[PDB]
């Protein structure tokens, strides 16, 4: 997890303020009243999870799936943005009536030269894929993607009476995607809607093609129907050269629902009655954290007001559609009430009682159980590949994280999160300006983290506010989108909470009074000082959710908060392959334990073996890490380095010695955290596993020299805690979840303080 | 006893596959002009699939799974004498399936007293180059 | 083989025939198969009509005994 | 008479990890978890020692009892 | 032996088992000591699992007419502790032709470094009949 | 059936089932039908026609011949 102060908060993490969305710099704060009321249909969302493994080349095909996938795609970052996915896959397909040659060769798989015609039909369809690369000879496709598409219309069933078998079909694995949508999200929506106006018509034209084909004859004869197969489909090609223009449209909706928002009355800003029906816009006014999406874009891009739309007519035809009512989107519309609510509440009491810590946090079991994949490449000889799964590193290791399924639940961590309670003296005058704020997501960390790039460095351009702007361009993506999640996520989420918001400019820069932010009301805290707001006039009124988010009384989490967990053994007797890499190939590595008694090195060395008592190597497999098992640990280990380097920086700044009990305790009580933490991890039965075997090894060291072989004299009281972290150690590093430069962390943590048990055991 | 008739069919069957890809080989080699060829080379494939399709019901449907469950206990069993089980996945797919299956209805037909055995290796010999890929199974 | 006959076009038709297509007796196979001579030598043997004089009452004649049926 | 390590068992005498029974081998050791339970009761009882002559003898013939010698 | 548990101290315990202890039959011995075949062949013959394929009607497959009392062995006093029952299939990924054991949950004492199967919770389930045993009382 | 009933409980005889699917494969009863068996076939079945050293009995008695230390 992670934290901020009550007061402050922009000296704290400017990333979590309006006014950085809005890219105020750091200076004034927004405040500037005057107001119009709003509603909410609690707005639009994604899913949250949803792991699961799509079937094609069954031949069904549907443009909802393959829209799916494309997205997916772009969320595993194969290449950039989806409308670049979008934009090369027309350049594809520019290979469309230029390449009569589709028509004719597959129908010459069809035999073929087809002008000697006949019901010729026999039997061979599934795999015009090896044909149909030849066709790739014919039509390169350094994606697979769009070659794995073409082979469709042939083959979808057509002819669908014969030809004939597949009894096999295809695969990909869609995991979880991005909760909340931004900008280059929702272009990559529509985008992926033409895409949608694309292939469903691609389906129909063949789909009655067929009824009138088989004109019997039989399936009737070729070098005709088939040798059309697709040219109107190539005219339902050209049918998609215009949907509309992306960025055009989504900034066109952005902005005249900005004009609807923004108190500016004149012409430029006159919401025509002849239009503020019509529609979907009535409730879609209502969607706020789209409206984070608003604010958004128009930090980036200023506003740009193309206005592609008129005042009404046609200020429909650029609203007629947009990527909620898309099915195109994983992303869906969301009804009334809950919002995406599944956080509870609780606060620190003095019995006066303002929160000196507000709760606020997770909801989330973690896998019970991963299975590692055995990569069986045969087929192709390149990116093919089978993974069979098999029980191996899986049952026995699973059933050990089964305490981990315990002991590490989020609600247990919160509930000693909120045992650092008392601080600061007595009782009762923990309270001086600023309470810490403390805060994480299951969300942020699982996405962010599953693109392999440790989120902290990005929570830490949060918590300076200021972009370090240094990355990739890649990278300057996952930082980009960790940023509107974050926010947003903690914006719809205190909207789920208050009932109430109103629109506000903003002014400063203005630029032209349309850049705009939120101020929000309640009433029941008490007479307080409390952020800026103290509380005046017996409501809040602030900008700035987080100020919102302290007030509010304890709760309850809502949401099934499991992780779900996918399961294949079917789908892999099926596959075939899809992009999968990342996992990565070998399933495991050695971590080297070391200890010294009698003044004697030791070095336990152990691998990497199944090390669970059954040989060797195995090999091969490699497992996926679960995002979220690893993610969770990664909020704490956020934490850790957190306090420790924070309130080292107060070991450097007040020299109070009171101040000096704090750091003292607050410290050396996260000293105790990860000290009872891995204290518990020790009796794990692998850390049991780690711990008879390891210590069998170096006590066969003791038989090494033949003095020190004088029995054990390693074992009193210190040595056996001391290596009860080495447990931990195996259930960090290579138990599939922690990525070292991390018991590296522990390490000197562990070097910080006296440790010992500290009692027990 | 020893079965007649049905070696005259299997036999013809056998033979006229030796006329069928030796003609169409030839029409590749020249015939000429490309709208032909692949049409051909795309006949062939689906006859070998043909084939295949067919072979897994001379075997794997009684009583030849008798042969592959058989053939899986030598194999895995020889893994462990050598020692590792290790790499043995291969219980598994098409490739090494095609291998196993058209091997075992092939057996089977071995056990049935007709088509020699030459008819074997020349057959594993016409589905090898054809493609195989499938992946029919299953 | 009939679904083979497209292939392979294009008609000819004058300069090499015709063919003998037609024949692939599952008697003639079974007749001499039944005493395990292998007819398919007898076949070659009516390829050029001639018998090669497999000197044997029990070799020759018995390939003969074929051709006539 | 032998011996063998209790966690490594199917390391060591593999075959007779009754896992071996079934063609089991795997990365997995068999096992996990499911149904429907009845205790299997009633075993064929002890043909062990129970040594003894016995006749053939009369042409009156037991065919029971020369089963059991066949 | 049982005396000689005693040695040697001192106590390990997790780091190397356990041990088989347990076997040491007059009746596997006696059952193929009577053909004279010499059992003790047969015995790393179980140790290795697999046999050693000594391919004559009556050499190979008496060695197997022995391996599968020696199984029928302990299953029934696995029985008696206890008549805890199934298990499932366990078809793995190949192949489904039916392959189901026997399961023994028992009842334990709470420390197990013995079994892979770490399964203590208040008893192990159990994967194999042996490990009952090993659990038993004497 | 008034007796496979009683092969319910004569399940002591497992393992025939392992070595079944080991020494073979896939069991299928192929002379099945439904009416037999049933029928007649369980109770041909050989313990009820008790030959052999087939023997039949309760419980431990098979086991009350092993020691345990």
Redesign the interface.
Do not use: C, M, W
């Given at each position: 997890g992670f934290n901020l102060k009550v007061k402050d908060l922009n000296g704290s993490a400017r990333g979590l303020t309006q006014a950085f969305a809005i890219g105020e710099l750091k200076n004034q704060l927004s405040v500037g009243a005057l107001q119009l009321p709003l509603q909410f249909t609690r707005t639009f969302s994604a899913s949250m999870t949803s792991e699961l493994l799509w079937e094609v080349g069954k031949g069904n095909i549907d443009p909802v799936m393959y829209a799916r996938l494309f997205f997916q795609y772009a969320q595993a970052g194969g290449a950039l943005s989806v409308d670049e996915l979008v934009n090369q896959f027309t350049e594809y397909h520019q290979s469309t009536a230029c390449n009569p040659e589709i028509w004719?060769?597959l129908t010459?798989?069809?035999?073929?030269?087809?002008?000697?015609a006949?019901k010729?039909d026999?039997?061979?369809k599934?795999?015009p894929t090896?044909?149909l690369e030849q066709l790739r000879t014919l039509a390169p496709s350094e994606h697979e993607l769009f070659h794995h598409i073409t082979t469709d219309f042939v083959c979808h069933v057509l002819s669908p009476l014969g030809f004939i078998?597949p009894?096999?079909a295809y695969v990909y694995r869609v995991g979880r995607t991005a909760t909340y949508p931004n900008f280059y999200a929702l272009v990559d929506c529509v985008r992926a809607s033409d895409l949608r106006r694309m292939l469903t018509a691609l389906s129909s034209v063949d789909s009655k093609m067929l009824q009138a084909t088989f004109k019997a004859k039989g399936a009737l004869a070729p070098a005709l129907i088939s040798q059309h197969l697709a040219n109107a489909a190539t005219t339902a090609f050209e049918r998609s050269r215009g949907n509309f223009d992306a960025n055009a449209v989504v900034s066109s909706v952005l902005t005249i629902l900005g004009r609807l928002w923004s108190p500016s009355t004149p012409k430029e800003l006159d919401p025509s009655a002849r239009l503020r029906n019509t529609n979907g816009i009535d409730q879609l006014r209502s969607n706020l954290a789209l409206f984070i999406a608003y604010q958004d874009m128009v930090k980036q891009r200023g506003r740009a007001e193309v206005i592609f739309s008129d005042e009404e007519l046609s200020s429909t035809i650029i609203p007629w559609f947009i990527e909620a009512m898309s099915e195109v989107s994983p992303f869906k519309l969301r009804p009334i009430n809950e919002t995406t609510s599944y956080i509870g509440q609780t606060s620190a009491i003095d019995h006066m009682g303002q929160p000196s810590h507000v709760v606020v946090y997770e909801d989330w079991q973690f896998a019970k159980e991963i299975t590692?994949f055995?990569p069986?490449k045969?087929?192709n000889n390149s990116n093919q590949r089978?993974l069979?799964?098999?029980?191996?590193i899986?049952?026995?290791m699973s059933?050990?994280l089964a305490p981990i399924g315990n002991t590490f639940a989020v609600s247990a961590f919160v509930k000693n999160r909120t045992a650092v309670y008392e601080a600061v003296s007595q009782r009762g005058t923990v309270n001086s300006n600023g309470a810490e704020m403390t805060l994480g997501f299951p969300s942020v960390v699982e996405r962010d983290y599953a693109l392999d790039r440790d989120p902290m460095v990005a929570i830490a351009a949060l918590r300076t506010g200021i972009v370090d702007e240094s990355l990739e361009a890649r990278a300057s993506n996952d930082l980009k989108r960790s940023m509107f999640n974050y926010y947003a996520a903690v914006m719809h989420y205190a909207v789920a909470h208050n009932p109430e918001v109103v629109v506000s400019e903003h002014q400063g820069v203005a630029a032209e009074q349309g850049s705009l932010y939120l101020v929000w009301n309640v009433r029941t805290e008490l007479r307080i000082p409390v952020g800026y707001n103290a509380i005046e006039g017996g409501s809040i009124r602030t900008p700035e959710p987080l100020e919102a988010i302290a007030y509010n009384k304890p709760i309850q989490p809502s949401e099934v908060l499991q992780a779900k967990v996918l399961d294949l053994?079917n789908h892999?007797?099926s596959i075939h392959i899809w992009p999968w890499h990342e996992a990565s190939t070998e399933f495991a590595y050695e971590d080297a334990y070391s200890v010294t008694i009698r003044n004697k090195r030791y070095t336990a060395e152990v691998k990497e073996f199944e090390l669970?008592?059954?040989?060797?190597?195995?090999?091969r497999?490699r497992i996926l890490k679960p995002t979220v098992a690893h993610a969770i640990i990664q909020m704490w280990y956020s934490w850790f380095v957190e306090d420790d380097r924070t309130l080292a920086a107060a070991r450097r700044t007040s020299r109070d010695d009171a101040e000096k009990l704090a750091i003292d305790g607050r410290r050396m009580q996260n000293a105790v955290t990860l000290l009872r933490k891995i204290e518990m991890i020790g009796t794990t039965?692998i850390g049991?596993?780690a711990?008879?075997?390891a210590?069998?090894?170096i006590?066969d060291q003791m038989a090494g020299r033949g003095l020190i072989d004088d029995?054990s004299d390693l074992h009193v009281g210190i040595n056996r805690h001391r290596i009860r972290i080495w447990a931990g150690l195996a259930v960090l590093q290579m138990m599939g979840l922690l990525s070292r430069s991390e018991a590296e962390a522990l390490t000197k943590v562990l070097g910080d303080s006296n440790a010992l048990g500290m009692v027990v055991a």
């Open positions: 004719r060769k010459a798989y069809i035999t073929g030269s087809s002008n000697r006949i010729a026999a039997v061979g599934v795999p090896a044909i078998l009894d096999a590692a055995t069986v045969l087929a089978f069979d799964v098999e029980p191996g899986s049952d026995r059933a050990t053994a892999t007797t669970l008592g059954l040989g060797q190597r195995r090999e497999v039965g049991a596993s711990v008879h075997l210590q069998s090894r006590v029995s």
